Amino acid sequence: MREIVHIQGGQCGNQIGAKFWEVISDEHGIDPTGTYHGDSDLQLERINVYYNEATGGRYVPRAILMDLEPGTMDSVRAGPFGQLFRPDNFVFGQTGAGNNWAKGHYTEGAELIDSVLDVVRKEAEGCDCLQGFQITHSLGGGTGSGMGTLLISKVREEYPDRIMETFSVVPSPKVSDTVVEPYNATLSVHQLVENADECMVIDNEALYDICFRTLKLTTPTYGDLNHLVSAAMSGVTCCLRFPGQLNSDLRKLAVNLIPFPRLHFFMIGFAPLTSRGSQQYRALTVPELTQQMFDAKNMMCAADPRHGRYLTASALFRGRMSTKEVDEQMLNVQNKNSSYFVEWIPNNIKSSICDIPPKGLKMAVTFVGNSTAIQEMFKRVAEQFTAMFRRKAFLHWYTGEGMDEMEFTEAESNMNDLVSEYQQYQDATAEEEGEFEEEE
């Protein structure tokens, strides 16, 4: 059991979800028509974690595809493995959010969520034991940010004990594919930091950086950006679906990743990713993969860990590796990066092993790292939001829907408090000398 309900909310979310549910159907051997054509019996021992066995031995994703735009349905239906998702589970508005948190949270989205909950409740009650939820939504756009947060707020009021995991695409200043991103994202994090157990911040900038450097793609498309997110998304929740030499799960990661309740933003990354030309040369060994996973480059977040200092990390190694060798590497990493690891809370790195690798690979890794570097990416959104909010630019749309200036202030406040806290975890290391402080 330990089942996971997936909600893919807002265009971005649905497209990530589309690729994700392809990735997981490969590892479990499910074919686009919902039949099992896997060779190993290990592929169907724990399937129930993601799929709810339908009649006639079809497998159906426990996905709730929500948007305020009816066009997206056509897109997720167009995709290969589009026939996997349950029609009933598709819930779509008509107008759309129009990149407006308010439209997706207070007015248009506020009418739809009631319908969505009734699906969420239905799929959650089916599970004998619910591990929790994996919400996949953009903070940048309205629907994903507006509804996404409103739903998250709703589900948490109904299912407090159940983990709330979120794979969210934060808006990057480099890309800036929308103007009002800073507003959406600022009002989002306020709702996320209160109602999300563990939020895995993803950034398009970084994902593009992984595609032009780590991999060498001539034309990285949002498909190829989604494929990296989906690879990681599997990694985070594998030791549920397969055996391990040392088992873990979502709650186990949370307990060891979140020291204090508010600092629950993490930088996901995937270690065995190599340029197709550069494969020959690269030797696939635990040390090699450990080097890449702790390279700032590998991280799917804009902020380089180097500026921050890891409060903790977690690795989820795949395939057949000697646990001793892993443990040797995790130790070795912590002695090297003396500065990039917090003084208090020693043996910062956690390690999980799962026996089953990802398809077409011998070994792999998935990395989840709570740093004070993640602060930096949130400062970018703050600086930008402030600059708009100094003048009350674009503010008449949000105010139009019925949101009040008070909200916009509290959102900034609440995000500033987060930013102060992550910086504070460098002041508790600043303990150093008890007689006098290092600044003089």
Partner: protein, 440 residues
């Protein structure tokens, strides 16, 4: 008739267990089905098993062993394993959701449901058992289940069964190599419970045993499964006296008298000595006098406490095979004469020797040489303090910050419990020096 109930709690417990029951099954000649093949035209190894296996009366032998996990994955592996038909379905007890490295979940929230079912199983097994010797228990004190539920069991067992000895083989986290960040918190809360309810607690730090594999078995990349096989051999060598015939017989009851001087000092170490790769077995004499010296080697200790800092309060040498009591006598006499090996004053004769004619079995696929002599030395050492000081220091860094407490507090544990525990372990490391102090 020399019956021993084995309680395997938590992943580390169960997986160690699997390796134990492979060895036992081979030793007595039980096949995976659970039917010994009736050969030699006489019951020659008849009643040897009645230590570890109850006859069902139909020609099927079942292990007297409760495997307990709050997580389903590890116990499932046993159910979909070679030994599926060996273990009694009911004896394999499963939980739906794991403790997730949180003592509190295991001791209050989740545990309190399952323990009720577990005790009922232990009662059913103890009814079959006529003149039970003791409860062997296997729990990780780094992990939730083994810390939490494993501590809750022992408490409950202590009231119900009373006198019946409780020998606890506990996988305390090595200081250099730690798998989880929240381990110190678990271990300390576990140790306080353990400190009052177990009779003798044998300490085994993975890292130490990992080093032994790299040193003695000459494996560059040891696994847990390689580690578990060495743990088994120890357990086998301890209980041996019961199962097989010997010159100088010991019993699980005897250790409790000869190894624990004072009630609170029941922590030990262990060192199985002729750990030799077949590659270097060619070039070694492997005389009793060598095996003994190899036992007291600081390195060959399976917990990473260097006993040269401490004083040996009591040793329990357990030999197996082509062993002559005269040969042993000299071996101990030379150790008593050595300087490096130092004994407390108040213990004038510390050694308890146990000689079994049965040699140790060579497990196929097993990283060991078939050898004609052996010894398992459980040693009460003042050095044990060192491990407890390092788990106290590593905890005192925490709980200054109130680091991970929110989790523990949320799941029922009052904050003050943490403070109580650290105060009782500090009281232990006071005692350990006090006994170490030469007599006034």
């Amino acid at each position: 008739m020399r019956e021993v109930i084995s309680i395997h709690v938590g992943q580390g417990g169960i997986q160690v267990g699997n390796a134990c029951w492979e060895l036992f099954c081979l030793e007595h000649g039980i096949q995976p089905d659970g039917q010994m093949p009736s050969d030699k035209t006489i019951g020659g190894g008849d009643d040897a098993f009645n230590t570890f296996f109850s006859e069902t009366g139909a020609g099927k032998h079942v292990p007297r062993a409760v495997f307990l996990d709050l997580e389903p994955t590890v116990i499932d592996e046993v159910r979909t394993g070679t030994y599926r038909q060996l273990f009694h379905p009911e004896q394999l007890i499963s939980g739906k959701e794991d403790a997730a490295n949180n003592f509190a979940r295991g001791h209050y929230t989740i545990g309190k449901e399952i323990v009720d079912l577990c005790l009922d199983r232990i009662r059913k097994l103890a009814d079959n058992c006529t003149g039970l010797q003791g409860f062997l228990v296997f729990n990780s004190v780094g992990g939730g289940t083994g810390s939490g539920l494993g501590s809750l069991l022992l408490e409950r067992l202590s009231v119900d069964y009373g006198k019946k000895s409780k020998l606890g083989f506990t996988i305390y986290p090595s200081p250099q190599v730690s798998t989880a960040v929240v381990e110190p918190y678990n271990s300390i809360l576990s140790t306080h419970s353990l400190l009052e309810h177990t009779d003798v607690a044998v300490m085994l730090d993975n890292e130490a045993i990992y080093d032994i594999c790299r040193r003695n078995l000459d494996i560059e990349r040891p696994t847990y499964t390689n580690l578990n096989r060495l743990i088994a051999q120890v357990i086998s060598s301890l209980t041996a006296s019961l199962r097989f015939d010997g010159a100088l017989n010991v019993d699980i009851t005897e250790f409790q008298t000869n190894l624990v001087p004072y009630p609170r000092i029941h922590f030990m170490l262990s060192s199985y000595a002729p750990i030799i790769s077949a590659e270097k077995a060619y070039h070694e004499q492997l005389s009793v006098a060598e095996i003994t010296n190899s036992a007291f080697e600081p390195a060959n200790m399976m917990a990473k406490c260097d006993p040269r800092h401490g004083k040996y309060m009591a040793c329990s040498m357990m030999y197996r095979g082509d062993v002559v009591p005269k040969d042993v006598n000299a071996s101990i006499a030379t150790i008593k004469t050595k300087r490096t090996i130092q004994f407390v004053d108040w213990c004038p004769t510390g050694f308890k020797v146990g000689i079994n004619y049965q040699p140790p079995t060579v497990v196929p696929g097993g990283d060991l040489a078939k050898v004609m002599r052996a010894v398992c030395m459980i040693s009460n050492s003042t050095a044990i303090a060192e491990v407890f000081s390092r788990l106290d220091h590593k905890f005192d860094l925490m709980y200054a910050k109130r680091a991970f407490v929110h989790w523990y507090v949320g799941e029922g544990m009052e904050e003050g419990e943490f403070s109580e525990a650290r105060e009782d372990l500090a009281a232990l490391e006071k005692d350990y020096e006090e006994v170490g102090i030469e007599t006034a």
